[PDB]
Structures are given as structure tokens and as C-alpha cells.
């Protein structure tokens, strides 16, 4: 009866998680991309990534919910019709702690800082999908001030990239357990078991954004984290992921 | 042609502050009250007071009252548009910001629950008595409420003296001659206190007479009356 209304920036990381959850739950939503093809400074979305989409908002009848995690929690709790896929196991399920654990672990990642780091310090990326010209966009004194900021911001970026690796280690091990427990003839499982969950939305969208930023090759591929690599390949083939997010890394598409 | 869009609950304290700023700044806004006259439990708005408005303006999405209001002040700088804050370097800025922050720190949520839970502490509450009997069958139903009311007295103490300076020095407002964001915070605060039955305990009959005079001036202001004239009326959904 009451309409679902979503205001969002299509390319923002948060909007991607929200819109994928909506698609995975088969919900009808009136979605408003408020982002402009070209800004006041005639920039396209991939030159404005630090400007950032930030905060989507859902309106559902009399409820107003801002921010990705809060919106996703509202959706999972509100749409309980039996036709509606659930992205979370029942709170009494023996699988619930595992799913909740990886959901919070992935949602704790500082994605905004990775993106800012990508643009400010592209020498730490490999095959970033953002053009190099987005990066380009008393004298000893201020010189020294900015030298120090640069030193400080690189130590921060390096610290959180190491933390990302430790998180992706736990994920790789978890996916090894799924690999071990699944026959090569069976349908491939997701992160926490056979059903696609909220932890999968977070992991999937995180990996796709790491790819975009150029922090994929340091973290999987070429023999590194092969289960994670296979997972990402599985993600890209998922019909829902492709329908919702198939073009979001494509800078040719406004 | 950027549209200004507001989703809000009319009777929500935070929405009232936002909508009054919009009118004081003469901004055109597409306002959507999402509240329903009756809940699933057939409660009316005055039973559901325990919200988060959101502005959409072109590409910007702003949640919560204070952020929406700061966004409005920073963005609509056309010279025709009244300003509600003086200037970040002006010497009047720190005074306004201080009272804005002081008022905005009040736990309105606690007072409204307390009004309903412990109506013996109210005088002429506008909430029907049967709300007590329903809420009291089933956040903090404790005597601590009197301490939050005493703390309120101290904030209203501070306001009364600030008003005392203004008249000694057209009627002034709290912080000088022009209507500011601190007046917004104060006017909506007083009006809600009136609604809850905590006006007579805090002003009137010789108590805090500058505050009484201030509240009466607020009620006559065209913008306030046009936007908030009915919000204390339980006959109106």
C-alpha cells in the first residue's frame, strides 16, 4: 500500500549496498538518483568521488531512515511477507552469529578513506579505474607543513591497507571452509553458507569498489587469495548484482 | 531549478524548528508531512511524540534538524534571503551559537515522556489524561525527572537574564534585534513546554516575566503563526 522511496547517489558505496538489498528482496522501490551527470565544475561522477554520495534516505509510509546500515536494517525487519527473501538468518539460527560477525567486520572498513587514498596517493594502487587526471586535481615553511601532512596521510593509508588485508585473510579462510564443505558438482555457496546474506552484499560491494580503486591486485589474483578471487567472479555473474551494479564501475556511463 | 524537498513529521519538535527556519528565510519548499492521523494502534499524534526530518536539495541529502538548518544557512546566500546567524567572525556570533547550543541540549524527549508518565508535575497539560493511563500500563519513569526539570530551570534562568539585558538595552529578540537560530530554538522549546504543561511552573504570574513577554511576542509573529499556529491543537491531525 505505502510506497518505498529512495533518494541516493547511484555511484556512492552506500547507495550500492542499499539498492542491491532492495533487488535481493524483490521489493518495489521508487528510486531517485539525485546525482547530476555534470557538476557546477563540469566534473563527471568519477572525478567527484571525494565529493561523495554519502547518505541515502529511505521513506516508507511515515518512516524516514537515513544511512545505509540503518536502511538495510529497516528493510530486513519490515518486509516479512513469505514471498520476501530474507538476507539474514533467524536470530536463533546457529548461522546467525557467523553472518552478523562478517557483516559488522566488513561494514567496519573505512571505504571513504580508501577512496581518498586512491586519489591522493595513486602510487599505492595498481590498475586503478579512476583516470590519472583526477589525482592531479616562508615558502619552505608551508612547503614543510604539506610535506608533513603527506607523510602523515601515507602512514594512515598504509596502516588501513594492512588492516584490510587482515580482514580479507579472515574472509579467505572462511571461503576455504565453504570450498572444503562443498562438492565441485554442487552449487557454489556464498560467504556464510548456501544463501546470499547481508554479509555477502557488504563483501560483494566492497570487493567491486576495491577493484574500481585499484586495491584489488594487491589483495587477490595471481595466486593470492584464490577463494576470494573465485568469490568475486561468482558475484559478478549473479543476476541481481549485474542488474543493479553491472555498470557502476564503468566510467564511460554517466 | 533545484527543488527544495522536505520530508518530516508535522508535530515533531525537530521538524518544527526546520519548517520555521524555512519560513523565516522565505525559501520555497515542497513539504511532505509523512505522519498518519492514526497509528496501527489507533493512537493520534500526541501519543507518538517519542523524529528525523530530511531535506533533498538538488544533489544534497541532509538528515536531522540541526544539519538541515546549518545547510540552509550556508547555502541560500542570495542577498534577499534573511540570515539567521550573524557572521562567523562577528562578535555576536559566539553569543547566539552559545544559546542555540544551550537550548538544543535540552532533553525534550525526556520531558514529554515525563509529562505523560507523571502528570502530577504538569499544570494545564494539553495532552488528554487518558494518555497517562495507557502509557503507564506499558524510557525512564523515575523521580530523576524532577532533577531534569530543575536543570531546565537553570537554562531558563540563563535565558531570563539574557532577556533582562535586552530590554534594558520594536522589541528585541534573545540575541539582539533580529530573529536568529537561537530564537528558533527558544520559541519552539517554549511552545512545546506549554503543550506539555510545564509553562506555568517556569513562567507567568510574576515568574520569569521577560520570558513570558518573549513567548507572547513569538505567538504574534506572522511566520511563527503561519507555520506553527496549530501544532499544539489536538483537534487537528
Numbering used by the authors:
A (entry chain A): 23 to 159, 186 to 302
B (entry chain B): 23 to 72, 76 to 163, 199 to 229, 235 to 302
Excerpt from the publication:
The ganglioside-induced differentiation-associated protein 1 (GDAP1) is an integral MOM protein, proposed to have an auxiliary role in mitochondrial fission and fusion, possibly via redox-dependent interactions with cytoskeletal components. GDAP1 has two GST-like domains, followed by a transmembrane helix, which anchors the protein into the MOM. Structural data have shown a covalently bound dimer interface in GDAP1, and while dimerisation is a common feature in catalytic GSTs, the GDAP1 dimer is formed differently, with a unique interface having a central disulphide bridge between Cys88 from each subunit. We carried out structural and biophysical analyses on several CMT-linked GDAP1 protein variants and describe new crystal structures of the autosomal recessive R120Q and the autosomal dominant A247V and R282H GDAP1 variants.
R282H is located on helix α8, and the side chain of Arg282 points inwards in the wild-type GDAP1 structure; it is stacked against Trp238 and makes hydrogen bonds to the backbone carbonyl groups of residues 236 and 237 in the α6-α7 loop. All these interactions are lost upon the mutation, and the His residue in the mutant is observed in a double conformation, making no side-chain hydrogen bond contacts. Arg282, studied here in the form of the CMT mutation R282H, is one of the most conserved residues in the GDAP1/GDAP1L1 subfamily. Its strong hydrogen bonding to the carbonyl groups in the ⍺6-⍺7 loop indicates a central role in GDAP1 structure. Arg282 is, in addition, optimally stacked against the aromatic side chain of Trp238, which is both a conserved residue and a CMT mutation target itself. This Arg-Trp-(⍺6-⍺7) unit is likely important for the stable folding of GDAP1. In the case of Arg282, mutation to His is indeed one of the most destabilising variants in the prediction, linked to a loss of several key interactions by the Arg282 side chain. Arg282 in GDAP1 interacts directly with the backbone of the ⍺6-⍺7 loop, and a similar interaction is observed in GST. This is another example of an Arg–loop backbone interaction in GDAP1 that is both conserved and relevant for human disease mutations. Ab initio modelling, here carried out on the R282H mutant, which was measured at the highest concentration, supported the presence of a dimeric GDAP1, corresponding to the conformation of the dimer we previously showed to fit the solution SAXS data for wild-type GDAP1.
